């Protein structure tokens, strides 16, 4: 063979690029799509377009525009710029509104600078924005704001936005406001961080800064004091008629009030009915309230007959958070994903005043998500097809006859596409299918009335052509058996793979609870280069604790992080050698984040299986990590709860066993999530026992080490180390 | 040759220890010596001893005593324990006092815990001590203490102790207390750091600390707000237990009060005469005031007729600060090292009320220090012997005839001993010589009356014969010519050095202003292992800006740090590489601190001479370093002064050029001196141009990376690096 391989320059410089089809549905019939930096509107039924916004229109705006969003009624567009990333989801920016009718910018009563979030009402053109930790509402883009809260206080009181931990762990989103479905009410959460301890780290900034600055974030580590939360609803329709419109509190149930708790879900049901879920600090008990506006009293009431209680015997509640409800039009019933009697996650259907739900799906497989609900159908993604827990397909269940279930995606192109996501139009008339593997991604448009394919949106044939002429790795997804249970693994295999030759193996690890590293997604990444150019088999493996294959497996690491998930990676490696195509002298392991911890635990296990390993931004001790995530899996680090296992599960306690391996440790200094602290303590421990290792810090990089230069630097650095570890003299 | 080499373990585990003989003169006739934990008193004339303190006297004391300090009159002993390091000289400790007459510990009115500094008066047994930034005085060990200052305040107001920058740079000590020669008066300085910005960094502590802490130190960076200082004198003979102490302030001369300035020297002349020097923040103007106590007034008066002005046109004043005066018995005249007209540092004789001084020494060589003064002789150390700048000998000059100069150490043992330091008895009747090279250290005792050599104190006999069984490297000290100027170098040469063989070379750099790395001192260090086990030549070179050779060379880097001193190392290496025994393909460079800065600048120079190098705790940008040190050499970083060269002289600007070399960058996270920031900015810059390098941070280590485990770990890592850099294909 004489075609070039997939090299590291190829990966780092993005020579081979995936084409996407990111559309935004503006109605049941139309979607927006960015083409040549023009923004086009598409008729779904026929596939014709017009230009919605010409690429010339903001030439003389004077600012690089970061993003855009159109009022639901089409009359205005919101423009975002001066974007500066905050955490994983949060950022600040400047904003302006362009009147789409008048074809004019709006210059009075403008959204202030340094605004933290902004949302259109779901209908019409109301705006809700958060500035200086307070909520404000405009009825019309050009009119003065109404202030909603007066309590905003930097790092202390958050109205309508999350604090660090609620952003990262609880909502995995920044905003904490929820418009009612026709824009009348605005629901919002308020977070109090007064007694939450601060993480403190240096930020060095450009070299022109003489003194480093101290970044200080309220961040509760395990067992520490948590933010408290309150919930409010204001009637925005009365702001123009009243001076200071009252924010009506809905208090948490008495069974949450008895101690530390969380607000873990907000979902509107109807115009006058909202639902909330709370979760005790011990994350095995949740309560859903369903609350109705009492018109004559102006107050919200949650009838105890409508409360629903979820609880767990074998582990925590939900995959990561208690699962969200989906309401039928009338708000009298709802669908929720919950773990059945066998431990598998399936769709359960509730009436709002009955506690017992009815299961509409079942089997040894799981529903991944509920994607849309019409009067006749519920659409959902699952891994049912062919018993492949790492597969994804779109299903449709007939509401009047549960035995009538159609796979809408399975057989469309079943050699090329086993992993789907979906985007439904506003009332589910159309759906876009997004196939992400095991062949090249494919984007298709479908009409829901007949379930027929309307046209191919993006098929990536341009790329396929280029890839024909490159020695690509292949991928093997399969299982092995242990104690009579299936555990999946995938392998990125060098081109011309030969079962008779002996290959070096790199074990790629994440292995956190409900993770999945063995799937059917097509990826171009570092592993691609390693299999293609360096002839390394890159393996991953879903051992105990992993997701989408049921509770028996997922909860097996309940309260016991740093055990089975760790042993099973080692076991995985023993089984690859046993396959006879793996050089037992050249087994490596590497992981980022949770994977950094597992890699490190495996390297300090004293197993003899691995020659070397790389840990990037690892957890090193569970007490250093955040309360919400750590406590969900570990409980509390108190003598009466689970301290023994917190202390027994640190990387540092294994320092002496790192004498047997070559170790590369890497961490960004401004990592606000897994604090440099945690690698500072691994390195100190290794020094203390006289172990030599390799280290790299990334100045002002966070958990993602995602900046362009640093991204390339870290994969270059790691490549040398892998090659060095494997080099044969 | 079947003998072992001096290995890396040998260096790190101190297999071969230099024996010393540290004594403390107590009179003109006797000294103390710590022998097998016992304290012995020696009579100098005869060499006989008695036991002063038996080691077992405190067997059941409670804690391990860190240090002892006997009152000058021999009645009491101060016991130091609970020693906790602060900066380079500062610490806190606890203290108890033992009465040698009553043979019992004092239990009444003990010195408080966390005492910052304590000192006996130079006669008798008074005590002055600092606690919570205030000065206290005990006339008797058991008597209640009088409080002298009430202004003391953490990180803000310092009485009788220094702030960070005065400790490190100005006094190079922590005390700011000066007893008068018979203990009547106590002179002290007060520092005010109110507007001095804080350096902040993380400290991680032991594993069990859940949240890292932020250390905050008042530290002025180049051009920032400096501390302000005041000077006071209190009569301790007139204290009341009923009235607050009265401190008489001596204000600085008007020509210092016009702007930012420093207090740089305090030296008592008599019982009632004290001298101070003040230095302008632009450190090329200093003035000495001489102030007499006015028995009528109770005030101290500094007659302008007694003011002494010192200035430099080519650089700064004094080697690092203006030199100390050595007064005669009556205090009417004094001796002081100042730069002569040829820019060589020589002894000048001053009358207290006359502007001009008289140089009593002269020549193209320099006086290192004045060590002792009698009515007949001044004893000094100089580098005159054989015009060797890196050698050190003891001389006496006859005060009535300056032509009568006698060398007291030159001829004692020329082959073994070319580097001396001395220690005189109280009245200069006896002196100790410490020879420390080029052969093994040798300690001897002498009498001044006829310069008889009484006896050998310690000759390092054991070690000598130990070393005979090891393949010890040799040291070569020589010079090269650059523009008709002699510049010196040293090479640590491997055993059995073979000039027809080609050796790899490591350039060991410091190169700071007034530095000296080519000398005759005998050292057992990293370079020793390198030459002996690894057969690497380790060279050091003293180029422009190096000290002890006149201001023509020392001042060449004035306002121009990171130029000639960097250029000169490259040229040295260049020249070394053209010698026949140097492998021009294997030349490395390393430095710590200022040498880390030079190493990095050299590596970024684009010279092509060096294949690899190591920088430990380097300065990277002069604006990050402290004011006193940096401004002395660079002036102010304003466009009206020397900003451009502050910006021309960064490691960061040279990042591109690292592309062609292998670089290891190492720094401790708790470095209060050269802040981690300096390396964080280096790392970021290399990341930004795409240059691979190696790195190592040391959690909670400071500038010395000196804790036993970190020490062994750093040298282990560096050894691995150098060996890898020097391996052939
Ligand atoms: C399919 C999916 C994945 C996740 N998450 C997002 C949060 N994520 C954690 C956020 N912080 C954690 C983290 O960063 N570490 C944990 C231990 S090592 C570092 C992961 C796990 C996956 N969510 C989710 C979780 C909570 C609310 C909504 C969605 N849903
Ligand atoms: C023979 C000698 C050496 C020094 N010094 C001590 C202080 N030292 C500086 C203290 N901080 C500096 C430092 O640590 N860096 C400077 C450049 S990189 C880091 C060195 C230089 C030599 N002194 C001295 C200086 C001032 C007062 C009294 C004595 N005398
Ligand atoms: C709108 O109403 C709120 C609540 O009634 C007012 O906020 C209160 O103001 C008082 C005194 O200023 C504080 O002591 C209370 O704690 C505040 N309560 C809350 C919930 O913030 C607010 O001032 C009103 N706004 C206007 C413009 O009148
Ligand atoms: C956020 O929480 C703190 C308590 O954790 C509240 O602060 C207290 O407020 C009362 C007045 O109602 C004071 O008397 C207390 O002394 C305060 N305690 C502390 C610890 O500061 C604060 O009001 C809360 N903020 C809200 C709800 O906006
Ligand atoms: C959105 O839903 C709200 C909530 O029901 C509607 O507000 C009510 O409108 C009816 C008119 O039929 C009145 O009887 C009630 O007094 C209103 N209640 C409140 C609290 O405002 C609102 O009309 C709907 N808005 C739109 C645009 O359809
Ligand atoms: C230490 O210095 C600060 C100034 O740096 C002094 O504070 C000033 O005090 C004067 C008189 O009391 C006031 O007029 C100023 O407003 C203060 N300035 C600032 C910036 O605080 C402080 O008093 C000094 N302390 C001592 C003991 O000398
Ligand atoms: C140390 O020297 C001081 C300063 O001269 C002595 O104090 C003076 O002593 C004389 C007698 O010799 C008295 O007439 C003065 O009134 C004293 N002056 C002051 C300012 O106190 C002191 O006696 C000496 N101290 C010791 C312990 O010998
Ligand atoms: C703007 O619009 C047209 C697409 O029809 C094209 O000429 C141009 O490439 C577009 N893109 C720009 C100006 O970035
Ligand atoms: C697409 O074509 C139809 C005609 O069949 C027309 O009515 C519709 O408005 C067109 N839509 C767009 C977005 O161009
Ligand atoms: C929730 O967890 C705690 C401790 O793990 C346990 O004692 C409690 O009974 C649990 N609740 C349920 C319903 O199992
Ligand atoms: C040394 O010897 C002399 C006797 O000649 C004696 O007086 C003196 O006290 C002795 N000194 C010591 C320190 O033991
Ligand atoms: C220092 O602390 C110890 C133990 O806490 C205490 O017993 C002792 O009295 C203290 N020392 C002084 C001088 O107060
Ligand atoms: C001495 O002065 C200080 C501060 O000025 C004051 O706090 C203290 O009360 C005074 N004490 C006496 C006894 O005068
Ligand atoms: C001190 O240095 C400055 C700045 O280079 C210079 O202008 C001046 O001549 C010097 N001061 C004296 C008193 O020589």
GROMACS .gro file of N, CA and C in nm, chain A residues 197-202 204-212 214 216 219-224 621 623-624 650 652 665 676-677 679-681 683-684 686-688 690-700 709-710 713 717 720, chain B residues 197-202 204-214 216 219-222 224 621 623-624 650 652 665 669 676-677 679-681 683-684 686-688 690-700 709-710 713 717 720:
model
  333
  197UNK      N    1  -1.795   2.746   5.058
  197UNK     CA    2  -1.653   2.777   5.053
  197UNK      C    3  -1.604   2.801   4.911
  198UNK      N    4  -1.496   2.876   4.900
  198UNK     CA    5  -1.443   2.919   4.772
  198UNK      C    6  -1.322   2.838   4.735
  199UNK      N    7  -1.321   2.791   4.610
  199UNK     CA    8  -1.196   2.748   4.547
  199UNK      C    9  -1.127   2.875   4.501
  200UNK      N   10  -0.994   2.874   4.512
  200UNK     CA   11  -0.907   2.987   4.479
  200UNK      C   12  -0.789   2.938   4.397
  201UNK      N   13  -0.770   2.996   4.280
  201UNK     CA   14  -0.654   2.961   4.199
  201UNK      C   15  -0.602   3.080   4.125
  202UNK      N   16  -0.475   3.075   4.090
  202UNK     CA   17  -0.413   3.178   4.010
  202UNK      C   18  -0.455   3.175   3.864
  204UNK      N   19  -0.301   3.378   3.535
  204UNK     CA   20  -0.179   3.454   3.507
  204UNK      C   21  -0.200   3.557   3.397
  205UNK      N   22  -0.285   3.524   3.299
  205UNK     CA   23  -0.328   3.618   3.195
  205UNK      C   24  -0.213   3.650   3.097
  206UNK      N   25  -0.232   3.746   3.007
  206UNK     CA   26  -0.120   3.786   2.918
  206UNK      C   27  -0.003   3.834   3.002
  207UNK      N   28   0.117   3.828   2.945
  207UNK     CA   29   0.238   3.856   3.021
  207UNK      C   30   0.244   4.000   3.070
  208UNK      N   31   0.164   4.087   3.008
  208UNK     CA   32   0.162   4.226   3.048
  208UNK      C   33   0.107   4.245   3.190
  209UNK      N   34   0.028   4.149   3.239
  209UNK     CA   35  -0.022   4.156   3.376
  209UNK      C   36   0.090   4.129   3.478
  210UNK      N   37   0.125   4.233   3.555
  210UNK     CA   38   0.233   4.226   3.653
  210UNK      C   39   0.203   4.127   3.766
  211UNK      N   40   0.085   4.139   3.827
  211UNK     CA   41   0.044   4.054   3.939
  211UNK      C   42  -0.059   3.954   3.894
  212UNK      N   43  -0.037   3.824   3.924
  212UNK     CA   44  -0.135   3.722   3.890
  212UNK      C   45  -0.264   3.752   3.964
  214UNK      N   46  -0.624   3.624   4.157
  214UNK     CA   47  -0.686   3.512   4.225
  214UNK      C   48  -0.832   3.500   4.184
  216UNK      N   49  -1.180   3.329   4.229
  216UNK     CA   50  -1.246   3.281   4.349
  216UNK      C   51  -1.391   3.246   4.316
  219UNK      N   52  -1.779   2.692   4.540
  219UNK     CA   53  -1.766   2.558   4.486
  219UNK      C   54  -1.760   2.467   4.606
  220UNK      N   55  -1.871   2.396   4.632
  220UNK     CA   56  -1.874   2.303   4.743
  220UNK      C   57  -1.811   2.169   4.706
  221UNK      N   58  -1.697   2.138   4.767
  221UNK     CA   59  -1.639   2.004   4.758
  221UNK      C   60  -1.723   1.910   4.845
  222UNK      N   61  -1.687   1.781   4.848
  222UNK     CA   62  -1.771   1.681   4.914
  222UNK      C   63  -1.787   1.703   5.063
  223UNK      N   64  -1.912   1.704   5.108
  223UNK     CA   65  -1.943   1.718   5.249
  223UNK      C   66  -1.950   1.862   5.295
  224UNK      N   67  -1.911   1.953   5.207
  224UNK     CA   68  -1.909   2.095   5.242
  224UNK      C   69  -2.049   2.158   5.230
  621UNK      N   70  -0.863   1.246   4.448
  621UNK     CA   71  -0.918   1.219   4.579
  621UNK      C   72  -1.060   1.275   4.577
  623UNK      N   73  -1.278   1.368   4.791
  623UNK     CA   74  -1.302   1.487   4.872
  623UNK      C   75  -1.266   1.619   4.802
  624UNK      N   76  -1.179   1.615   4.700
  624UNK     CA   77  -1.148   1.738   4.624
  624UNK      C   78  -1.254   1.776   4.521
  650UNK      N   79  -0.810   0.706   4.703
  650UNK     CA   80  -0.727   0.814   4.648
  650UNK      C   81  -0.615   0.759   4.561
  652UNK      N   82  -0.308   0.906   4.550
  652UNK     CA   83  -0.190   0.922   4.635
  652UNK      C   84  -0.153   0.798   4.719
  665UNK      N   85   0.175   1.296   3.365
  665UNK     CA   86   0.068   1.365   3.437
  665UNK      C   87   0.053   1.505   3.384
  676UNK      N   88  -0.642   2.197   3.981
  676UNK     CA   89  -0.500   2.165   3.971
  676UNK      C   90  -0.454   2.102   4.102
  677UNK      N   91  -0.512   2.150   4.213
  677UNK     CA   92  -0.496   2.087   4.343
  677UNK      C   93  -0.480   1.933   4.337
  679UNK      N   94  -0.392   1.730   4.091
  679UNK     CA   95  -0.261   1.686   4.035
  679UNK      C   96  -0.139   1.734   4.116
  680UNK      N   97  -0.150   1.853   4.174
  680UNK     CA   98  -0.056   1.899   4.275
  680UNK      C   99  -0.039   1.797   4.387
  681UNK      N  100  -0.146   1.730   4.427
  681UNK     CA  101  -0.132   1.628   4.532
  681UNK      C  102  -0.081   1.491   4.482
  683UNK      N  103   0.144   1.466   4.238
  683UNK     CA  104   0.286   1.487   4.214
  683UNK      C  105   0.361   1.493   4.347
  684UNK      N  106   0.302   1.558   4.447
  684UNK     CA  107   0.366   1.566   4.579
  684UNK      C  108   0.387   1.426   4.636
  686UNK      N  109   0.420   1.148   4.473
  686UNK     CA  110   0.516   1.071   4.396
  686UNK      C  111   0.658   1.113   4.430
  687UNK      N  112   0.677   1.243   4.447
  687UNK     CA  113   0.802   1.296   4.498
  687UNK      C  114   0.835   1.233   4.633
  688UNK      N  115   0.736   1.232   4.723
  688UNK     CA  116   0.756   1.187   4.861
  688UNK      C  117   0.804   1.043   4.872
  690UNK      N  118   0.996   0.911   4.615
  690UNK     CA  119   1.107   0.904   4.522
  690UNK      C  120   1.075   0.833   4.391
  691UNK      N  121   0.959   0.862   4.332
  691UNK     CA  122   0.923   0.807   4.202
  691UNK      C  123   0.945   0.909   4.090
  692UNK      N  124   1.015   0.869   3.985
  692UNK     CA  125   1.030   0.956   3.870
  692UNK      C  126   0.913   0.944   3.774
  693UNK      N  127   0.864   1.057   3.728
  693UNK     CA  128   0.755   1.059   3.630
  693UNK      C  129   0.769   1.178   3.538
  694UNK      N  130   0.675   1.196   3.449
  694UNK     CA  131   0.675   1.310   3.357
  694UNK      C  132   0.553   1.395   3.388
  695UNK      N  133   0.570   1.526   3.376
  695UNK     CA  134   0.466   1.621   3.412
  695UNK      C  135   0.452   1.731   3.310
  696UNK      N  136   0.331   1.785   3.298
  696UNK     CA  137   0.306   1.903   3.216
  696UNK      C  138   0.185   1.981   3.269
  697UNK      N  139   0.207   2.110   3.293
  697UNK     CA  140   0.101   2.201   3.336
  697UNK      C  141   0.066   2.288   3.216
  698UNK      N  142  -0.061   2.324   3.203
  698UNK     CA  143  -0.098   2.415   3.095
  698UNK      C  144  -0.149   2.546   3.155
  699UNK      N  145  -0.066   2.651   3.144
  699UNK     CA  146  -0.094   2.785   3.201
  699UNK      C  147  -0.225   2.840   3.147
  700UNK      N  148  -0.317   2.868   3.238
  700UNK     CA  149  -0.446   2.935   3.208
  700UNK      C  150  -0.543   2.852   3.123
  709UNK      N  151  -0.393   2.646   2.056
  709UNK     CA  152  -0.251   2.617   2.071
  709UNK      C  153  -0.223   2.506   2.171
  710UNK      N  154  -0.292   2.511   2.285
  710UNK     CA  155  -0.273   2.413   2.391
  710UNK      C  156  -0.322   2.275   2.349
  713UNK      N  157  -0.057   2.134   2.143
  713UNK     CA  158   0.060   2.111   2.225
  713UNK      C  159   0.046   1.983   2.304
  717UNK      N  160   0.259   1.652   2.274
  717UNK     CA  161   0.338   1.605   2.388
  717UNK      C  162   0.314   1.458   2.419
  720UNK      N  163   0.471   1.197   2.141
  720UNK     CA  164   0.611   1.164   2.173
  720UNK      C  165   0.618   1.059   2.282
  926UNK      N  166   0.143   4.613   4.694
  926UNK     CA  167   0.049   4.511   4.645
  926UNK      C  168   0.090   4.372   4.694
  927UNK      N  169  -0.005   4.280   4.694
  927UNK     CA  170   0.014   4.146   4.743
  927UNK      C  171   0.037   4.051   4.626
  928UNK      N  172   0.147   3.975   4.630
  928UNK     CA  173   0.158   3.851   4.553
  928UNK      C  174   0.071   3.745   4.621
  929UNK      N  175  -0.010   3.676   4.540
  929UNK     CA  176  -0.094   3.568   4.589
  929UNK      C  177  -0.061   3.442   4.510
  930UNK      N  178  -0.059   3.328   4.579
  930UNK     CA  179  -0.046   3.197   4.515
  930UNK      C  180  -0.109   3.089   4.603
  931UNK      N  181  -0.140   2.975   4.543
  931UNK     CA  182  -0.198   2.862   4.615
  931UNK      C  183  -0.095   2.780   4.694
  933UNK      N  184  -0.103   2.400   4.883
  933UNK     CA  185  -0.190   2.283   4.880
  933UNK      C  186  -0.191   2.205   5.010
  934UNK      N  187  -0.079   2.214   5.083
  934UNK     CA  188  -0.062   2.150   5.213
  934UNK      C  189  -0.072   1.999   5.204
  935UNK      N  190  -0.095   1.935   5.319
  935UNK     CA  191  -0.109   1.790   5.324
  935UNK      C  192  -0.236   1.745   5.253
  936UNK      N  193  -0.236   1.619   5.214
  936UNK     CA  194  -0.346   1.558   5.141
  936UNK      C  195  -0.483   1.595   5.201
  937UNK      N  196  -0.492   1.592   5.334
  937UNK     CA  197  -0.617   1.612   5.408
  937UNK      C  198  -0.680   1.754   5.403
  938UNK      N  199  -0.609   1.852   5.348
  938UNK     CA  200  -0.666   1.986   5.336
  938UNK      C  201  -0.755   1.990   5.210
  939UNK      N  202  -0.886   1.997   5.232
  939UNK     CA  203  -0.984   1.985   5.124
  939UNK      C  204  -0.977   2.102   5.026
  940UNK      N  205  -0.960   2.223   5.079
  940UNK     CA  206  -0.948   2.343   4.999
  940UNK      C  207  -0.809   2.399   5.008
  941UNK      N  208  -0.744   2.421   4.892
  941UNK     CA  209  -0.612   2.482   4.900
  941UNK      C  210  -0.620   2.623   4.961
  942UNK      N  211  -0.511   2.670   5.019
  942UNK     CA  212  -0.513   2.807   5.067
  942UNK      C  213  -0.434   2.902   4.979
  943UNK      N  214  -0.468   3.029   4.994
  943UNK     CA  215  -0.404   3.135   4.922
  943UNK      C  216  -0.315   3.209   5.019
  945UNK      N  217  -0.064   3.522   5.081
  945UNK     CA  218  -0.065   3.660   5.037
  945UNK      C  219   0.052   3.730   5.104
  948UNK      N  220   0.460   4.230   4.848
  948UNK     CA  221   0.576   4.208   4.765
  948UNK      C  222   0.574   4.313   4.656
  949UNK      N  223   0.667   4.407   4.659
  949UNK     CA  224   0.658   4.503   4.548
  949UNK      C  225   0.737   4.457   4.426
  950UNK      N  226   0.670   4.452   4.312
  950UNK     CA  227   0.732   4.420   4.183
  950UNK      C  228   0.790   4.546   4.122
  951UNK      N  229   0.876   4.533   4.020
  951UNK     CA  230   0.946   4.649   3.966
  951UNK      C  231   0.850   4.764   3.934
  953UNK      N  232   0.639   4.913   4.138
  953UNK     CA  233   0.516   4.917   4.218
  953UNK      C  234   0.535   5.002   4.345
 1350UNK      N  235   1.071   3.761   3.308
 1350UNK     CA  236   1.040   3.900   3.272
 1350UNK      C  237   1.068   3.991   3.392
 1352UNK      N  238   0.976   4.271   3.501
 1352UNK     CA  239   0.864   4.333   3.567
 1352UNK      C  240   0.796   4.245   3.671
 1353UNK      N  241   0.828   4.116   3.670
 1353UNK     CA  242   0.769   4.020   3.763
 1353UNK      C  243   0.854   4.009   3.887
 1379UNK      N  244   1.286   3.983   2.785
 1379UNK     CA  245   1.205   3.870   2.831
 1379UNK      C  246   1.244   3.740   2.761
 1381UNK      N  247   1.006   3.524   2.708
 1381UNK     CA  248   0.885   3.508   2.630
 1381UNK      C  249   0.896   3.550   2.483
 1394UNK      N  250   1.198   2.283   3.190
 1394UNK     CA  251   1.158   2.396   3.273
 1394UNK      C  252   1.097   2.345   3.406
 1398UNK      N  253   0.576   2.552   4.311
 1398UNK     CA  254   0.450   2.630   4.317
 1398UNK      C  255   0.439   2.730   4.432
 1405UNK      N  256   0.604   3.143   4.068
 1405UNK     CA  257   0.569   3.044   3.967
 1405UNK      C  258   0.523   3.109   3.833
 1406UNK      N  259   0.447   3.218   3.845
 1406UNK     CA  260   0.411   3.304   3.733
 1406UNK      C  261   0.521   3.314   3.625
 1408UNK      N  262   0.757   3.112   3.527
 1408UNK     CA  263   0.758   2.993   3.442
 1408UNK      C  264   0.624   2.971   3.373
 1409UNK      N  265   0.515   3.004   3.441
 1409UNK     CA  266   0.384   2.987   3.379
 1409UNK      C  267   0.379   3.070   3.251
 1410UNK      N  268   0.445   3.184   3.252
 1410UNK     CA  269   0.445   3.270   3.134
 1410UNK      C  270   0.536   3.216   3.026
 1412UNK      N  271   0.600   2.883   2.984
 1412UNK     CA  272   0.530   2.767   2.931
 1412UNK      C  273   0.421   2.810   2.832
 1413UNK      N  274   0.338   2.907   2.870
 1413UNK     CA  275   0.235   2.961   2.782
 1413UNK      C  276   0.294   3.011   2.649
 1415UNK      N  277   0.578   2.924   2.490
 1415UNK     CA  278   0.623   2.814   2.406
 1415UNK      C  279   0.505   2.741   2.347
 1416UNK      N  280   0.404   2.713   2.430
 1416UNK     CA  281   0.277   2.657   2.383
 1416UNK      C  282   0.226   2.739   2.265
 1417UNK      N  283   0.228   2.872   2.279
 1417UNK     CA  284   0.174   2.961   2.177
 1417UNK      C  285   0.248   2.961   2.041
 1419UNK      N  286   0.413   2.676   1.939
 1419UNK     CA  287   0.416   2.537   1.897
 1419UNK      C  288   0.546   2.462   1.928
 1420UNK      N  289   0.617   2.503   2.033
 1420UNK     CA  290   0.744   2.436   2.070
 1420UNK      C  291   0.728   2.332   2.180
 1421UNK      N  292   0.764   2.206   2.152
 1421UNK     CA  293   0.769   2.101   2.256
 1421UNK      C  294   0.881   2.123   2.359
 1422UNK      N  295   0.853   2.091   2.485
 1422UNK     CA  296   0.950   2.097   2.593
 1422UNK      C  297   0.906   2.005   2.703
 1423UNK      N  298   0.997   1.984   2.797
 1423UNK     CA  299   0.973   1.908   2.918
 1423UNK      C  300   0.948   2.006   3.030
 1424UNK      N  301   0.878   1.962   3.135
 1424UNK     CA  302   0.847   2.048   3.248
 1424UNK      C  303   0.827   1.970   3.379
 1425UNK      N  304   0.842   2.038   3.492
 1425UNK     CA  305   0.822   1.978   3.622
 1425UNK      C  306   0.791   2.091   3.717
 1426UNK      N  307   0.676   2.079   3.783
 1426UNK     CA  308   0.641   2.169   3.890
 1426UNK      C  309   0.663   2.092   4.019
 1427UNK      N  310   0.689   2.164   4.128
 1427UNK     CA  311   0.702   2.100   4.259
 1427UNK      C  312   0.605   2.167   4.349
 1428UNK      N  313   0.502   2.091   4.383
 1428UNK     CA  314   0.398   2.132   4.473
 1428UNK      C  315   0.456   2.173   4.609
 1429UNK      N  316   0.427   2.297   4.650
 1429UNK     CA  317   0.457   2.351   4.783
 1429UNK      C  318   0.609   2.369   4.809
 1438UNK      N  319   1.304   1.520   4.998
 1438UNK     CA  320   1.248   1.440   4.889
 1438UNK      C  321   1.245   1.517   4.757
 1439UNK      N  322   1.206   1.644   4.761
 1439UNK     CA  323   1.205   1.722   4.639
 1439UNK      C  324   1.345   1.739   4.583
 1442UNK      N  325   1.451   1.421   4.411
 1442UNK     CA  326   1.368   1.408   4.293
 1442UNK      C  327   1.409   1.501   4.177
 1446UNK      N  328   1.566   1.379   3.815
 1446UNK     CA  329   1.499   1.413   3.691
 1446UNK      C  330   1.592   1.482   3.592
 1449UNK      N  331   1.841   1.232   3.455
 1449UNK     CA  332   1.778   1.160   3.343
 1449UNK      C  333   1.779   1.244   3.214
   0.00000   0.00000   0.00000
